[PDB]
Coordinates of C-alpha atoms and ligand atoms in Angstrom, one line a residue:
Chain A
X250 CA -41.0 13.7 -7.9
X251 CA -40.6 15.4 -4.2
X252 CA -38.9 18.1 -2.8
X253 CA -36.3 19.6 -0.5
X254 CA -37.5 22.9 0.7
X255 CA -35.4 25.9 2.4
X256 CA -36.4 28.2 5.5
X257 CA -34.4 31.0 3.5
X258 CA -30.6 31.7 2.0
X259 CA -29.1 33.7 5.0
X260 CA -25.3 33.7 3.0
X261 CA -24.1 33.2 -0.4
X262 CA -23.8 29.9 -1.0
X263 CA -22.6 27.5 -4.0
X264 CA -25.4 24.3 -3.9
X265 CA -25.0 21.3 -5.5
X266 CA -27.7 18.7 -6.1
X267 CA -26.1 15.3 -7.1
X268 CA -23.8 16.5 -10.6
X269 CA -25.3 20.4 -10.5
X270 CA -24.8 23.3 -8.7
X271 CA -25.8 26.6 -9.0
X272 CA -25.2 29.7 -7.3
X273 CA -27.0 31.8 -4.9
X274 CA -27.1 35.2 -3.4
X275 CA -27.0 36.5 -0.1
X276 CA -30.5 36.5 0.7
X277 CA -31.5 35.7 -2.4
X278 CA -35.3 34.9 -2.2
X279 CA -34.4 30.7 -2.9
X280 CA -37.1 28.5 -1.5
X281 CA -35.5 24.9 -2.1
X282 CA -35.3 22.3 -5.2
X283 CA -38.2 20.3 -6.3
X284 CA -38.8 17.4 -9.2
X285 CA -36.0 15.1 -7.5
X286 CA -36.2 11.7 -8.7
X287 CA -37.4 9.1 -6.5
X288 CA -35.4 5.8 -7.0
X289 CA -32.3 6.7 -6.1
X290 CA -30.0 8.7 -3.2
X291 CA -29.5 11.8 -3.6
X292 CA -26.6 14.3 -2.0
X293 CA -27.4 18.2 -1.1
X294 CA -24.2 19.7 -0.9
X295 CA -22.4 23.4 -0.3
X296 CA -19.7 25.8 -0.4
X297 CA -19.9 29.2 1.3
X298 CA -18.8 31.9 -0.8
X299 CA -16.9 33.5 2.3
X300 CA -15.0 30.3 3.0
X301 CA -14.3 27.8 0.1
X302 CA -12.7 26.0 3.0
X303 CA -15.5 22.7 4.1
X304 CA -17.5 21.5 1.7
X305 CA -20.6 20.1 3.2
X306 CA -23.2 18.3 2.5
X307 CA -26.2 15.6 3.0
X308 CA -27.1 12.0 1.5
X309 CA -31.4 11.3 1.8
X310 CA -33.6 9.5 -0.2
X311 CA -37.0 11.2 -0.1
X312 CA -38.6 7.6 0.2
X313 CA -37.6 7.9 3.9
X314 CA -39.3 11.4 4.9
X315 CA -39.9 14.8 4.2
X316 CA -36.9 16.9 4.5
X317 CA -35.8 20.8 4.3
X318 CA -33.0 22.7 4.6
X319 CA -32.5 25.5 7.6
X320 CA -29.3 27.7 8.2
X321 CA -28.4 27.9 11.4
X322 CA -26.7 31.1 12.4
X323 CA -24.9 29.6 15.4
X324 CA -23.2 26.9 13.9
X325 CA -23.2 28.8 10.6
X326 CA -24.3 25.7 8.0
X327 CA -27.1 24.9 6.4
X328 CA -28.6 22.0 7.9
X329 CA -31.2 19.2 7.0
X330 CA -33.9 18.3 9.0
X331 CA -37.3 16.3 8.8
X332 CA -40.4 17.8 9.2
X333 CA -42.5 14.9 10.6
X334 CA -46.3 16.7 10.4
X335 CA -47.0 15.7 6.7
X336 CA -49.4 18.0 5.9
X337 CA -47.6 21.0 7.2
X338 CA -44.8 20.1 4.5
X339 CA -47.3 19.8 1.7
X340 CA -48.4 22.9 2.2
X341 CA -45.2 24.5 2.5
X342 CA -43.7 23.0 -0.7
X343 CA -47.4 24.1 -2.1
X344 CA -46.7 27.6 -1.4
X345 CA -42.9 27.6 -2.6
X346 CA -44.6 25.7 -5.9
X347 CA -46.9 28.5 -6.7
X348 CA -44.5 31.4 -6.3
X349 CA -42.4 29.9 -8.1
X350 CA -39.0 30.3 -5.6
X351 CA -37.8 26.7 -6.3
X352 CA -35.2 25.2 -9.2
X353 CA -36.2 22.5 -10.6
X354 CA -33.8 19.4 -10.6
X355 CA -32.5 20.0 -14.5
X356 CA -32.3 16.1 -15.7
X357 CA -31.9 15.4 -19.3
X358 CA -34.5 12.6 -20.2
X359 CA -32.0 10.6 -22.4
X360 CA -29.4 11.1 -18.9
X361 CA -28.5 8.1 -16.6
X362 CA -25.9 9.5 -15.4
X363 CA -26.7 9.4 -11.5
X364 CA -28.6 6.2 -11.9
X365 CA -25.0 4.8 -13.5
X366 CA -23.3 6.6 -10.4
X367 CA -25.6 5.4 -7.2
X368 CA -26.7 1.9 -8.9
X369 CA -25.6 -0.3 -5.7
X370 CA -25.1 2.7 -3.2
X371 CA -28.3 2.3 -0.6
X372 CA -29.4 4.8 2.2
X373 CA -28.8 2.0 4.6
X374 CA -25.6 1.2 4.1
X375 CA -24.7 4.6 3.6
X376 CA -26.4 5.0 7.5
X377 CA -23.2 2.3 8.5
X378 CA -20.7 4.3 7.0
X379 CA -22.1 7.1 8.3
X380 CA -23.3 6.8 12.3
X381 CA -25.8 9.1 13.5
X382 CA -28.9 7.3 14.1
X383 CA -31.3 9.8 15.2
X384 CA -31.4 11.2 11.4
X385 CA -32.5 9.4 8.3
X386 CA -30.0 11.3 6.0
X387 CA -26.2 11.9 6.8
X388 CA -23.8 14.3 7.1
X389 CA -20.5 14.3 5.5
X390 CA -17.9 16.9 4.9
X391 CA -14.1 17.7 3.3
X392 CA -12.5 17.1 6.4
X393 CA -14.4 13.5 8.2
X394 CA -11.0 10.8 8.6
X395 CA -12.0 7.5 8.0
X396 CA -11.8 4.7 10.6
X397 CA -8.7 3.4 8.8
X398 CA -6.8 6.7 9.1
X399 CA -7.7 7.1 12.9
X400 CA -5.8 4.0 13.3
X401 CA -2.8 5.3 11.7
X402 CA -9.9 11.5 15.9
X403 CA -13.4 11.6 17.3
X404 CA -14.7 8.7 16.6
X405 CA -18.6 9.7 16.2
X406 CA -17.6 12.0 13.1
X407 CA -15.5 9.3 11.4
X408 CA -16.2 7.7 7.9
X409 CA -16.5 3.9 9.2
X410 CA -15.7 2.2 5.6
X411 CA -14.3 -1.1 5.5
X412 CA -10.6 -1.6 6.4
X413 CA -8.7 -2.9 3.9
X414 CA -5.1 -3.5 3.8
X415 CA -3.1 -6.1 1.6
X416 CA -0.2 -6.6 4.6
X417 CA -2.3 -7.5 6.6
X418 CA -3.4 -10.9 8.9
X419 CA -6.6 -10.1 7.3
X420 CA -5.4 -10.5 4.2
X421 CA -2.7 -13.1 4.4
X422 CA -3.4 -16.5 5.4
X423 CA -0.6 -18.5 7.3
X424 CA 1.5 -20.7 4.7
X425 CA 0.3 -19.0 2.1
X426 CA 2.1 -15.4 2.0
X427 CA 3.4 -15.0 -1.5
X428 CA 0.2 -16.7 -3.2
X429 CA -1.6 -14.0 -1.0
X430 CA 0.3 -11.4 -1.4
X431 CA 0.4 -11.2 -5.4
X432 CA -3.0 -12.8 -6.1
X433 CA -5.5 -11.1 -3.7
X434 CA -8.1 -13.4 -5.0
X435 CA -8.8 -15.6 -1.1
X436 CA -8.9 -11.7 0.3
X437 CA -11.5 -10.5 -2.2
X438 CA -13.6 -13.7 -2.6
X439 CA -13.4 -15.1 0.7
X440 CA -12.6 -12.6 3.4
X441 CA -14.2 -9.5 1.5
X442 CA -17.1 -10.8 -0.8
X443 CA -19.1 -13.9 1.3
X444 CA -17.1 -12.9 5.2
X445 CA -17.7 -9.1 5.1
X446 CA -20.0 -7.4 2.8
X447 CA -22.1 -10.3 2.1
X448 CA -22.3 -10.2 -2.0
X449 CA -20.7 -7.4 -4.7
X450 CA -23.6 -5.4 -4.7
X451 CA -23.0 -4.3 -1.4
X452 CA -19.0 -3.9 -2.5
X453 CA -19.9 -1.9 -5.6
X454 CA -22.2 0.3 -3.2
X455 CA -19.4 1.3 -0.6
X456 CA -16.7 1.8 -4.0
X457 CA -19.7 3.9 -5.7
X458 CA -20.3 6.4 -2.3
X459 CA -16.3 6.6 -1.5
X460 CA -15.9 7.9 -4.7
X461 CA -18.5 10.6 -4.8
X462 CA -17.3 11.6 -1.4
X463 CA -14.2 12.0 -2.6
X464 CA -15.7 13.9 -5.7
X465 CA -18.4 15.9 -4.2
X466 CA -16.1 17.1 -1.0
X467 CA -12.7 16.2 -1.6
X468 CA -12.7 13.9 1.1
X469 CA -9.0 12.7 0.8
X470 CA -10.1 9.1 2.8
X471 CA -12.3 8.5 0.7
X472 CA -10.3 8.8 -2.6
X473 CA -8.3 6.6 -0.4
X474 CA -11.0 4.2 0.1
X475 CA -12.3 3.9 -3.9
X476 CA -8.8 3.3 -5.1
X477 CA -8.5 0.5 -2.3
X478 CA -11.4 -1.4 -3.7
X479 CA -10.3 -1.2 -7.3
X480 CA -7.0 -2.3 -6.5
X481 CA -7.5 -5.1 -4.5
X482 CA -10.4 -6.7 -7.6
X483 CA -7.7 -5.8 -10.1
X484 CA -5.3 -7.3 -8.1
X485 CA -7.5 -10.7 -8.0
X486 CA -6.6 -13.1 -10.9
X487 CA -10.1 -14.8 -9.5
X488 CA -12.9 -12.6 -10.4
X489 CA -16.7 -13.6 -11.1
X490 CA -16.9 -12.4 -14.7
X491 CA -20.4 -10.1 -13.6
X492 CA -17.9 -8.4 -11.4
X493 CA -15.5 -7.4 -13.9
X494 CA -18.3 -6.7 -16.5
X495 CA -19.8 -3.9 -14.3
X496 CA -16.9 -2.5 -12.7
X497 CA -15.7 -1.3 -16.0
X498 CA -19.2 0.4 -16.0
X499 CA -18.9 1.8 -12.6
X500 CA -15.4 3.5 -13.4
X501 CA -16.3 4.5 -17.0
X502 CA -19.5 6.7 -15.5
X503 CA -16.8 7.8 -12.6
X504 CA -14.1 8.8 -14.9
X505 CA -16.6 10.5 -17.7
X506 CA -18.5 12.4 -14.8
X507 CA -14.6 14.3 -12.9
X508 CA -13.8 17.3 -13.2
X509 CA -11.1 17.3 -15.9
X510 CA -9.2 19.7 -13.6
X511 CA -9.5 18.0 -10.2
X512 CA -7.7 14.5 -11.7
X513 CA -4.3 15.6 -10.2
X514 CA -5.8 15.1 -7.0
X515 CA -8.5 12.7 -7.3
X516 CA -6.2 10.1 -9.3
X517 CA -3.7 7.9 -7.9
X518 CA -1.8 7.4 -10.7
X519 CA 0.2 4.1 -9.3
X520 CA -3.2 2.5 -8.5
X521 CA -4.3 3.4 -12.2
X522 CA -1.1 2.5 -14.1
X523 CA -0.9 -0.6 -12.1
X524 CA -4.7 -1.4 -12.7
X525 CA -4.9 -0.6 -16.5
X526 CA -1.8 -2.2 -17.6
X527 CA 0.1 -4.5 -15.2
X528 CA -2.8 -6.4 -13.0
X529 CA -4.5 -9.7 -13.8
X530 CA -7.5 -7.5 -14.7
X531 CA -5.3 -5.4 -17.1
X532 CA -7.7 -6.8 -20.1
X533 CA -11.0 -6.4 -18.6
X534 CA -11.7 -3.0 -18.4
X535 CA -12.3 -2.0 -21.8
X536 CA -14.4 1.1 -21.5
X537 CA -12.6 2.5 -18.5
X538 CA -8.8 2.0 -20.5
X539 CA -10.6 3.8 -23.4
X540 CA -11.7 6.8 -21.5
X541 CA -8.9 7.2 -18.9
X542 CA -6.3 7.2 -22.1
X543 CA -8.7 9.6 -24.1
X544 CA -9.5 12.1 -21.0
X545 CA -6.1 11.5 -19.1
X546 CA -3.3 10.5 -21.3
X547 CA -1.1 12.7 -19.1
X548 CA -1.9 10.5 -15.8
X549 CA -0.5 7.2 -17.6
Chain B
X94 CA 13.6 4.5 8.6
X95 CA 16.4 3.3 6.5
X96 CA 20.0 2.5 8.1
X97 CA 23.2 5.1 6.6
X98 CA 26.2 6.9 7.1
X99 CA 24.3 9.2 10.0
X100 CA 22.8 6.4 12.2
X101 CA 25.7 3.5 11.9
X102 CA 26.7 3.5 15.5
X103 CA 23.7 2.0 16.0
X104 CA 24.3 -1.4 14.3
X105 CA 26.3 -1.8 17.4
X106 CA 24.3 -0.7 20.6
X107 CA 22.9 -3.3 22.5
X108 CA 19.5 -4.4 20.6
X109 CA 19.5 -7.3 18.7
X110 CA 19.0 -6.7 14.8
X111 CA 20.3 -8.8 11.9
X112 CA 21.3 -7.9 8.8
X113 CA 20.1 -10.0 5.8
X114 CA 21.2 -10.6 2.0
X115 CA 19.2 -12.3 -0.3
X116 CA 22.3 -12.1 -2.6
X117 CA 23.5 -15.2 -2.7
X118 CA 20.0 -17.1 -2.7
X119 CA 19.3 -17.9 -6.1
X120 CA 22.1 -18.6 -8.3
X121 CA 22.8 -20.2 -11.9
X122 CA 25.0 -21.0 -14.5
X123 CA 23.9 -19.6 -18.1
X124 CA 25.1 -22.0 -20.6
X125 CA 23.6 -22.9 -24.7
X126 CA 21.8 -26.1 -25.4
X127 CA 21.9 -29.0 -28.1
X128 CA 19.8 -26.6 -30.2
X129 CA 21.7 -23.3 -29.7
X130 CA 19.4 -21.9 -27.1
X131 CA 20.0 -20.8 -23.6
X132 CA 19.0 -22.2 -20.6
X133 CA 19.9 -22.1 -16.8
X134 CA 21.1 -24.3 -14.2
X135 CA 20.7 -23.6 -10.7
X136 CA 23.4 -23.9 -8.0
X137 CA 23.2 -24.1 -3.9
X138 CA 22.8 -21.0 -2.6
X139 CA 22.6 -19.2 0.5
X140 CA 20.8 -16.8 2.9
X141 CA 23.3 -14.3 4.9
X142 CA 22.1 -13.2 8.2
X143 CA 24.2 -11.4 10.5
X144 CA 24.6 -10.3 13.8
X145 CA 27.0 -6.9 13.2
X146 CA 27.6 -6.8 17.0
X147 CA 28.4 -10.2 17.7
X148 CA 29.3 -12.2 14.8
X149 CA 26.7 -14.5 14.8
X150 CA 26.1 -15.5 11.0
X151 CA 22.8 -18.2 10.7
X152 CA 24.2 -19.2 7.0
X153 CA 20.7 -21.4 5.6
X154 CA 21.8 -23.0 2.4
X155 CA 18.8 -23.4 -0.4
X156 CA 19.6 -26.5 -1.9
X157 CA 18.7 -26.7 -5.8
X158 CA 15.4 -29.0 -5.2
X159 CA 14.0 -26.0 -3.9
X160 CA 13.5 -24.7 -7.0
X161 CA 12.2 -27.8 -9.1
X162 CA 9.0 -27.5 -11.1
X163 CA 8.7 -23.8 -9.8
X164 CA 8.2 -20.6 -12.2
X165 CA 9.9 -16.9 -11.6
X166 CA 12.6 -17.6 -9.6
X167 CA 14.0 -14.9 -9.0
X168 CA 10.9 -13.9 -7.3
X169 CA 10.2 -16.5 -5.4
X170 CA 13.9 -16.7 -4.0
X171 CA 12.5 -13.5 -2.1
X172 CA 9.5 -15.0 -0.5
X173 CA 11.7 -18.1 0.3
X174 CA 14.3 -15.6 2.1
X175 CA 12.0 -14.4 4.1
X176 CA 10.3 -17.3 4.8
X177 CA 13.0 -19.0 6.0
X178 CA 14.0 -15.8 8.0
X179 CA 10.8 -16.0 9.7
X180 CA 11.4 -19.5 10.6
X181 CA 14.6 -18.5 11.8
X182 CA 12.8 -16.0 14.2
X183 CA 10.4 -18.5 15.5
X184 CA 13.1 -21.1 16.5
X185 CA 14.9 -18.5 18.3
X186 CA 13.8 -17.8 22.1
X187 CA 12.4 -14.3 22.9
X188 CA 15.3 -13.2 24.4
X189 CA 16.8 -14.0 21.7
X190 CA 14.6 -12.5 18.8
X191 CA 15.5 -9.8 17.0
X192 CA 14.4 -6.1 17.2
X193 CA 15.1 -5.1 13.8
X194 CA 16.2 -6.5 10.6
X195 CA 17.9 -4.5 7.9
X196 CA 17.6 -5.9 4.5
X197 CA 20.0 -5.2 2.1
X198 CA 18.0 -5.3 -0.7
X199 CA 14.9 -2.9 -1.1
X200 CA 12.9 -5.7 -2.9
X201 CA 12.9 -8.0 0.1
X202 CA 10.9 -5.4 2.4
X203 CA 7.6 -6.2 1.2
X204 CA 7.9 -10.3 1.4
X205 CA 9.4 -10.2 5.0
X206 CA 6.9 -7.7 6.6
X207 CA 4.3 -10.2 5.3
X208 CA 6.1 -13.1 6.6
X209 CA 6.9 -11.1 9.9
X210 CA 3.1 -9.9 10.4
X211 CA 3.0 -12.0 13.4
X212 CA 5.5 -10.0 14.6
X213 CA 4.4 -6.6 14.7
X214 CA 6.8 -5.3 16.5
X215 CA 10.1 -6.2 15.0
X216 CA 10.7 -3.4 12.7
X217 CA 11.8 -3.8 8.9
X218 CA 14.0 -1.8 7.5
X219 CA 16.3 -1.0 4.3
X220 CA 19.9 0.7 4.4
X221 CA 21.4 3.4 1.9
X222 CA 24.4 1.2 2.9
X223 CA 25.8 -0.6 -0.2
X224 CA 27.3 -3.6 1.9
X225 CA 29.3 -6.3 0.0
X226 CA 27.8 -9.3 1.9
X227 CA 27.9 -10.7 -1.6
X228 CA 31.0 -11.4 -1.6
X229 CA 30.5 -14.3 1.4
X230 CA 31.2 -16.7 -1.1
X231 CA 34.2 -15.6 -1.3
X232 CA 35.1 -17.3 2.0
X233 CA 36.4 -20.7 1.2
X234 CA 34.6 -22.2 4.1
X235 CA 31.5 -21.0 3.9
X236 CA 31.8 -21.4 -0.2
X237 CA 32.6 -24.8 1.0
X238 CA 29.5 -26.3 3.3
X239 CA 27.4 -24.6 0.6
X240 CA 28.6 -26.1 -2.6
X241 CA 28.7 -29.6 -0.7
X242 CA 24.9 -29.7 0.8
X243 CA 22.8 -32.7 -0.5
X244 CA 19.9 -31.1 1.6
X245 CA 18.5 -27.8 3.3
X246 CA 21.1 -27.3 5.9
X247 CA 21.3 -24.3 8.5
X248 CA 25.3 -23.6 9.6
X249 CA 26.1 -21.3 12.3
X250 CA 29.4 -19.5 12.1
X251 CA 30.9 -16.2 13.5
X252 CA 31.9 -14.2 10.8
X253 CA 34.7 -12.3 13.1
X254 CA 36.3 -15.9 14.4
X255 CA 38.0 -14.6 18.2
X256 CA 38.8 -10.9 16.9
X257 CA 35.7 -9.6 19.8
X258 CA 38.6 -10.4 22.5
X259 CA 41.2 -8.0 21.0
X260 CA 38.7 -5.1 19.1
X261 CA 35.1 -3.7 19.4
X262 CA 32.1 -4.6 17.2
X263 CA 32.5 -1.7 15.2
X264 CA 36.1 -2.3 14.1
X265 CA 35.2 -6.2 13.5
X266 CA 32.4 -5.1 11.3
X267 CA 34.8 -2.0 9.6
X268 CA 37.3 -5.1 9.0
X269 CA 34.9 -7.6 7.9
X270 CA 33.2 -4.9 5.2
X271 CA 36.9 -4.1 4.2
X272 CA 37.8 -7.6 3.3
X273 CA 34.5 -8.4 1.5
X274 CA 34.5 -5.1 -0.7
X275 CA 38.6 -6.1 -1.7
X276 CA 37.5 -9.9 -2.2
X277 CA 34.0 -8.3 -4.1
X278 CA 36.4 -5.9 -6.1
X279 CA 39.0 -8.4 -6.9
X280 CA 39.0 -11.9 -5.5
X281 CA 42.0 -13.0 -6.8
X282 CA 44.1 -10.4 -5.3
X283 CA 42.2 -10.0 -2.3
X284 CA 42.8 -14.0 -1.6
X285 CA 46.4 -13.8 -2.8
X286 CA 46.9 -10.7 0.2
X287 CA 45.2 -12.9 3.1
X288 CA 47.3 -16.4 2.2
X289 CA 50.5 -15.0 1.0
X290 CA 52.7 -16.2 3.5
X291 CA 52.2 -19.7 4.3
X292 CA 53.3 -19.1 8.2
X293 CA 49.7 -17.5 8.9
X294 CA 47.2 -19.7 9.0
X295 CA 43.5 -20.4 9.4
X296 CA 42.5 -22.3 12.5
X297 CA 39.8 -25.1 12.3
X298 CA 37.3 -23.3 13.7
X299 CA 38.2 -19.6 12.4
X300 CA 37.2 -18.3 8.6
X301 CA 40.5 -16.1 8.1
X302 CA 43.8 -16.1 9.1
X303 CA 45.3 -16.2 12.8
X304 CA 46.8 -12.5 12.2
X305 CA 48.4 -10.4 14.7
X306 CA 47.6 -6.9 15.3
X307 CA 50.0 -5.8 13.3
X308 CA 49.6 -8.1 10.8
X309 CA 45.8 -7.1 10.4
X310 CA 47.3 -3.5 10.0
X311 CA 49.6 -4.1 7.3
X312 CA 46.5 -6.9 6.0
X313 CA 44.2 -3.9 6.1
X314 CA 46.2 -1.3 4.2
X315 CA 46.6 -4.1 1.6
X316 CA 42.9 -4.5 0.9
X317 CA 42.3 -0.7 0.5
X318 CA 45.6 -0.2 -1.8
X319 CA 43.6 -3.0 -3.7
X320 CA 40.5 -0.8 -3.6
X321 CA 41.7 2.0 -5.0
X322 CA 43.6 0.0 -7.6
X323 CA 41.0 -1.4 -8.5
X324 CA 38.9 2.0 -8.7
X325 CA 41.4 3.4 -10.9
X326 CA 41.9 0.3 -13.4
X327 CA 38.5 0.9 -13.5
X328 CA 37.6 4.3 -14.1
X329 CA 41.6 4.7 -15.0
X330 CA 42.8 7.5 -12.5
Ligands
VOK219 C1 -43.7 25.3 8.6 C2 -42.4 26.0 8.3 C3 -41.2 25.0 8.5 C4 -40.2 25.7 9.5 C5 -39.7 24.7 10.5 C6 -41.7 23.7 9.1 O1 -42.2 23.7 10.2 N1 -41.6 22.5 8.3 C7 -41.0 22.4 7.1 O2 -41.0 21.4 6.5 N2 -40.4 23.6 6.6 C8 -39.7 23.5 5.3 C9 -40.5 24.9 7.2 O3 -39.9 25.8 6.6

């Protein structure tokens, strides 16, 4: 179980850990969060108390280093850094330990919750999406564009997910436009799946981190981005049947872990309506049919 | 964006666009069977596309084999529309090629863009126009070629025969939408106003009669007395 120290808590600050949060004061005497599971990413993420506006945050996987959190007065965020002298770390997460100025990361044993949110989603690949090579974690905020909505503007602050559009050359082979166009099956399997991210682990990992983005900072191209890669498997009559099996898990754990007052935002309700009841795949998501019409009737 | 009442001058400025309807494309007689069911049979059909500033019509007629052993018709005689407009594109030169085309129909805007990806920058766009280019077969001729094609045939006509000598682009096209809408409204009448007297006629290589200015005058006022008629026989007013 490690640990993510802080220097101090300058400003009031909302923190969230994965799925919690908690609150704390200006100057409040809070000295970091310890017991994280190893295993699995993990996000850090914050909202000032003076400026709701830019949510903020940072994915790491302690595997990778020892990490802290500083706030810098200049640029006025807390940042992450590594602290690369190991045994200076220890002994500053020692003395945190003792006097007892850390929470504890509260995980219900019986929970998989964030295991059934990050299962593909891998520090690497999050590293391609994100570019900024001199740091082992990432940085992502409420306001990043994607590199599909540049196209449509620095480009070393951008969200680089994988482009996907259905009118598209990419998408649409020659002499074959309408089979394309209504079966997206060549784009998934072919173009998507073996050309570009190799196998559907790697698919489900980029779906699994737009959507906590889009969750976790109300990143707007990255809502854009999850609802892409449903669309275009649901709108596949081809599917491998493994696929279809877990993405009904991967949405189910998505839709039960929303807020139930942020789905006017966070759900597109064409992509859903479309999805659940007119697609190929309209049949093959049983658990994520029964909890979208149990938790948002209203949507559909 | 889409084409209306506020940008209509610019069907006739000097940058080649075409209009097309899918109207015509895909057409059947309903009738019962042996067994008291109902079943369709296709007939020719046709694309419309149009040139509003010259004329130009590039009338492709879908013969009925297109449709044999194929499922959802009605769909796939919009991916064949644009499909065959595309070809249509790609036989033309450059110069030649089209900077827009305006679809009548909303539902053919997302099969042409993907058959037009290869050309990015021909834009395509709807109307809030409700045009009657339905009603082309109406016009005995080109009713004509396309009931009597044994194969996929293109035919190039110009929809306003010499009228370009006498009157401007937008008056042809004011004319031509007049005459469709009567003949869409009430063929019968509409064909009864055009061929009344027997001393007008159509030359080989025209579509409608050989009228005079005047004539088209007193023509024109016919077809919108019609109209209204028509409107009120309706709605009765
Ligand atoms: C030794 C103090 C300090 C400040 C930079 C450090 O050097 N290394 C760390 O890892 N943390 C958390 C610290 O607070």
């Amino acid at each position: 179980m490690n640990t993510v120290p802080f220097t101090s808590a300058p400003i009031e600050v909302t923190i969230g850990i994965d799925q919690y949060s908690f609150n704390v004061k200006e100057n409040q005497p809070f000295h970091g969060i310890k017991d994280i599971p190893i295993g699995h990413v993990h996000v850090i993420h914050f909202q000032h108390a003076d400026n709701s506006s830019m949510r903020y945050g940072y994915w790491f996987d302690c595997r990778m280093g020892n990490f802290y959190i500083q706030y810098d007065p200049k640029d006025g965020l807390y940042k992450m850094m590594e602290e690369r002298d190991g045994a200076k770390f220890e002994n500053i997460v020692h003395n945190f330990k003792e006097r007892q100025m850390m929470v504890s990361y509260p995980k219900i044993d019986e929970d998989d919750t964030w295991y059934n949110l990050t299962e593909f989603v891998q520090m690497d690949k999050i590293r391609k999406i994100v570019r900024k090579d001199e740091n082992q974690f990432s940085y992502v905020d409420s306001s990043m564009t994607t590199v599909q909505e540049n196209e449509l503007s620095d480009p070393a602050h951008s969200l680089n997910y994988t482009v996907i559009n259905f009118k598209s050359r990419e998408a649409i082979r020659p002499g074959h436009e309408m089979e394309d166009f209504l079966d997206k099956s060549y784009y998934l399997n072919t173009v998507m799946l073996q050309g570009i991210f190799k196998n559907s682990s790697n698919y489900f990992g980029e779906l699994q981190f737009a959507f906590l983005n889009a969750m976790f900072f109300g990143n707007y191209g990255s809502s854009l981005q999850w609802h892409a890669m449903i669309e275009l498997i649901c709108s596949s009559a081809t599917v491998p049947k493994h696929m279809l099996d877990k993405l009904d898990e991967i949405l189910y754990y998505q839709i039960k872990t929303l807020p139930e007052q942020y789905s006017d935002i966070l759900l597109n309700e064409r992509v859903w309506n479309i999805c659940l009841y007119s697609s190929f795949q309209k049949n093959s998501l049983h658990n994520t049919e029964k909890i979208m019409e149990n938790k948002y009737p209203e949507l559909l | 964006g889409a084409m209306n009442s506020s940008n209509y001058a610019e069907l006739f400025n000097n940058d080649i666009k075409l209009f097309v309807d899918d109207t015509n494309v895909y057409r059947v007689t309903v009738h019962k069977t042996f067994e008291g069911n109902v079943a369709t049979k296709a007939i020719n059909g046709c694309i419309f596309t149009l040139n509003p500033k010259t004329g130009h019509l590039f009338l492709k007629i879908i013969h009925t084999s297109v449709w044999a052993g194929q499922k959802r018709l009605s769909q796939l005689a919009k991916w064949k529309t644009a499909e065959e407009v595309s070809a249509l594109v790609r036989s033309l030169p450059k110069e030649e090629q089209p900077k827009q085309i305006i679809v009548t129909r909303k539902a053919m805007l997302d099969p042409l863009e993907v058959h037009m990806l290869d050309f990015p920058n021909i834009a395509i766009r709807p109307t809030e126009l409700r045009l009657p280019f339905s009603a082309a077969m109406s016009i005995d001729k080109l009713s004509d070629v396309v009931m009597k094609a044994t194969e996929p045939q293109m035919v190039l006509f110009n929809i306003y025969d010499d009228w370009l000598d006498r009157i401007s682009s937008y008056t042809a096209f004011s004319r031509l939408t007049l005459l469709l809408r009567a003949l869409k409204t009430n063929e019968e009448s509409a064909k009864m106003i055009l061929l009344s007297d027997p001393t007008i006629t159509i030359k080989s290589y025209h579509l409608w009669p050989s009228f005079t200015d005047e004539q088209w005058i007193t023509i024109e006022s016919q077809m919108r007395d019609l109209i209204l008629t028509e409107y009120g026989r309706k709605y009765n007013v």
